[PDB]
Structure 1
Amino acid sequence: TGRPEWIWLALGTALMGLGTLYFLVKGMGVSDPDAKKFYAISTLVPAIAFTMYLSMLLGYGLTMVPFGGEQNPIYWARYADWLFTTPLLLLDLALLVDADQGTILALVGADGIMIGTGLVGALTKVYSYRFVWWAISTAAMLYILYVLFFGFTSKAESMRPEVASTFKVLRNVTVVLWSAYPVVWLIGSEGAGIVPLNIETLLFMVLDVSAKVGFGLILLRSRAIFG
């Protein structure tokens, strides 16, 4: 097939894979119980992404959805990835500030809605309705970000400055990166079709790699992960 976006898929695969192995190697050497928890979560995240990037590279996870008078190329494999990677990243942040079970449940639940409505919107055949689902998915994300900024930051103040300062950074990287996804979706292939798929794939790989390997490197190299 040789689609224009494959090089970004191959690059995403490579980066996720290398990041996975390095976290795996680093994680199985640590003896601390808590640090092991964070490592297992942070390694599984890029591991899931690698497999999905690989699948997409190999021609799977792609479907032609009709709308706007066109047969639009929608990579649904992305939601299969994010369905499990986004709540795992949220869990990493939750364990860090000692969030409550109710908070985590609600964050994972909101996250499920965000990805669920996101995919339904990416598969919707009525053009304008695609944005109705997109709208709801974004509202869900704004709820998650509100909680991360107003809730978690507050409970991280009961933590040690080293831990509070690590969370601040991860929280900041997450707010900035996650905020970008709904915009790429809106102006890209799933939405307005302004930005081409090849470029759109490039944008997604930069955000995904940054949000998983970038995030993991920052979190796993800190001493805040220790019990």
Structure 2
Amino acid sequence: ITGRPEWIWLALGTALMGLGTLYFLVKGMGVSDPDAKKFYAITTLVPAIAFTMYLSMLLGYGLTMVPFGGEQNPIYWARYADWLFTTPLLLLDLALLVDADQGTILALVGADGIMIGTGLVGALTKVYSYRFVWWAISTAAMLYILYVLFFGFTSKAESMRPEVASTFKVLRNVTVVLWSAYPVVWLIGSEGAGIVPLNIETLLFMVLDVSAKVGFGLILLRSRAIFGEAE
């Protein structure tokens, strides 16, 4: 395990996701409100899935070698397995907060699936120049998602409770900033142009992942917006 310099960040990531999972699990024990239960379920599952995939990367299972540029390049494929399930759960948290219509939710989840799926294909593609074609398609799917979060959701939040409108606005802003960093790190890291070494890349993704999951969850689950308006 320690044979890879990036192991320290995989281990820290595993620990922080594990701790985040346990914290949300305990916190949600005292919850009976049916609406709050939905948000706790979604939000606890996110770091639990990430915990398993960080562990698989730490132990070496979630790593494969991909030939491109005349080299055997270490590619952590387990990231995409994580993201396939956790990024639509994160979007679902946002969509339920603002009572999004079903068509909009399906558009978001579908675009998200395309985003992660094409990122996976790009990560595993052996023809170097083609990796960036997949990156571009994935990034276009991301831009669609960000567009919807701003010009379909923000003006939906404003007709809702003030506490859900303010909580949505904060989580929207956190999401757009954090999620936009992922394609940049991929592009300059070992999957793309290879300018930033894998150990630093792994650190960067770990900070983004913990912030986008445990950070996000801490903000959401401390808000009164997750509860039905009750006396």
- Normalising by structure 1, we get a TM-score of 0.99
Structure 1 position 50, deviation (Å): 0.3
Alpha-carbon distance, 1:200 to partner: 0.2
Deviation at 1:27, TM superposition (A): 1.0
Displacement of 1:28 in angstroms is 1.9
Q: Deviations over 1:163-200 (max 9, x none)?
A: 10000010000000000000000000100011000000
Deviates further, 63-72 or 37-46: 63-72
Q: CA deviation at 1:31?
A: 1.3
Matches of 1:15 and 1:109, distance apart in 2: 29
- Could you give the per-residue CA deviations for residues 71-92 of structure 1, whole angstroms, max 9, x where no partner exists? 1111000000000000000000
Cα drift, residue 225 of structure 1: 0.2
Gap regions ≥5 residues in structure 1: none
Structure 1 residue 25 displacement after superposition: 0.7
The separation in 2 between residues aligned to 1:28 and 1:149, in whole angstroms, is 33
Q: Deviations over 1:111-168 (max 9, x none)?
A: 0000000000000000000000000000000000100011110110111111100000
Runs of 4+ in 1 over 6 A off after TM superposition: none
Shift of 1:216: 0.2
CA distance in 2, matches of 1:29, 1:8: 33
Kindly state the Cα deviation for residue 2 of structure 1 after the two structures are TM-superposed: 1.9
Identity %: 100
1:69, CA displacement in angstroms? 1.4
Per-residue deviation at 1:61?
Answer: 1.1
Output the TM-score relative to the length of structure 2: 0.97
d(CA) in 1 for partners of 2:61, 2:148: 35
Moved more, 158-167 or 180-189: 158-167
Instruction: Give the secondary-structure state (helix, strand or coil) at the position aligned to 1:158.
Output: coil
How far apart, CA to CA, are the structure 2 residues paired with 1:162 and 1:116?
35
Q: What is the rounded CA distance, in whole Å, between the counterparts of 2:211 and 2:146 in structure 1?
A: 17
Secondary structure of the 1:74 match is strand
Unmatched segments (≥5 aa) in structure 2: none
The answer to whether residue 60 in structure 2 is matched with residue 59 in structure 1 is yes
d(CA) in 2 for partners of 1:69 and 1:182?
24
- CA drift of 1:20 comes to 0.5
| Pairwise CA distance, 1:30 | 1.1
> Offset of 1:94 from its aligned partner?
0.2
User: What is the deviation of 1:3?
Assistant: 0.3
**How far did residue 108 of structure 1 move?**
0.3
Distance 2:142 2:29 in 1: 33
Whole-Å separation in 1 of the counterparts to 2:131 and 2:211: 27
Query: What's the counterpart of residue 209 of structure 1?
Result: 210
| Number of equivalences | 227
Q: Deviations over 1:5-24 (max 9, x none)?
A: 01000000000011111101
In 1, Cα distance between equivalents of 2:53 and 2:227:
31
Q: Distance in 2 between matches of 1:158 and 1:99?
A: 12
**Whole-Å Cα distance in 1 between the matches of residues 68 and 180 of structure 2?**
26
Residue deviations 1:31-81 (CA, integer Å, cap 9, x gap): 111001000000000000000001110111111111111111110000000
**Who is 1:219 aligned against?**
220
Q: Quote the offset at 1:4 in angstroms.
A: 0.5
